[PDB]
Ligand binder design. Structure first.
Ligand SMILES: [Ca+2]
Ligand code: NA
Length: 259
């Protein structure tokens, strides 16, 4: 059931972090779960600080919302920023102070692939507008795995590449005209990249779209509310067809409607 994004609902708070380590972070579910995980399995990474390596895993939504993790993974190398995703049994994350994407198989705690994103800026060159070293943002949509970034050659405009999820090879690349540091975050739905105008405003918008099928860029005015005024992470989950976000200690989700 694919289509163009036409509406975003009110943010729903699922969990509020209890320490400043959780002011910003990423939380994720797998749109292609694999044993021993299910559609309920939830991963959470608080990303404040300089040696981020703990991943909280919750077998059940009840545990994610009301209780303790069922497992803590200690990543073998530290992680950068809020851009990570989980896809088909692996956490895909960026190595701290690097342009390297790492595929970490969760059930075996094994690194399966590492890839330098060619020419990608990193560590504060092309972050989203809030900073936070958000230069590299992974994404999953109905067609699989992508990475959102920029390069000097693109002069800071958003570049997106489709990734092979097994070995991280780039399969195809598109260059937009949207300055990455001028938008708060971005995500991909049904092959279209969407951006959010502000990470602070209760009256933000989903303000730009780039359709990878046609190469056409559009301006949009879809209301988007940052309930807690500091959104560090905004991603799309194509199985649930919802936005997942992290907003000033709060793990939130937004319903959407496609046309
Ligand atoms: Ca994102
Ligand atoms: Na992401």
């Amino acid at each position: 059931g694919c289509g163009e994004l036409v509406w975003v609902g009110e943010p729903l708070t699922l969990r509020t972090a209890e320490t400043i380590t959780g002011k910003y972070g990423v939380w994720m579910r797998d749109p292609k779960p694999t044993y021993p995980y299910t559609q309920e399995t939830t991963w959470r990474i608080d990303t404040v600080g300089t040696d981020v390596h703990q991943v909280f895993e919750y077998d059940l939504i009840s545990q994610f919302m009301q209780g303790y993790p069922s497992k803590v993974h200690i990543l073998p190398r530290p992680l950068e920023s809020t851009g990570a995703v989980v896809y088909s049994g692996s956490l895909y994350f960026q190595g701290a102070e690097s342009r390297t994407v790492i595929r970490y198989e969760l059930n075996t705690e094994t690194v399966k692939a590492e890839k330098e994103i060619p020419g990608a800026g990193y560590h504060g060159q092309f972050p989203y507008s809030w900073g936070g070293y958000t230069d590299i943002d992974l994404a999953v949509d109905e067609a699989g795995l992508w990475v959102i970034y920029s390069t000097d050659e693109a002069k800071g405009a958003i570049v997106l590449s489709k990734l092979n999820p097994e070995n991280l090879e780039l399969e195809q690349t598109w260059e937009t005209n949207i300055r990455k540091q001028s938008v708060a975050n971005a995500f991909i739905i049904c092959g279209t990249l969407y951006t959010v105008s502000s990470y602070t405003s209760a009256d933000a918008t989903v303000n730009f779209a780039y359709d990878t099928g046609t190469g056409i860029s559009k301006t949009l005015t879809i209301p988007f509310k940052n309930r807690y005024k500091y959104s560090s992470m905004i991603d799309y989950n194509p199985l649930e067809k919802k936005l997942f976000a992290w907003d000033n200690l709060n793990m939130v989700t937004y319903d959407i409607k496609l046309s």
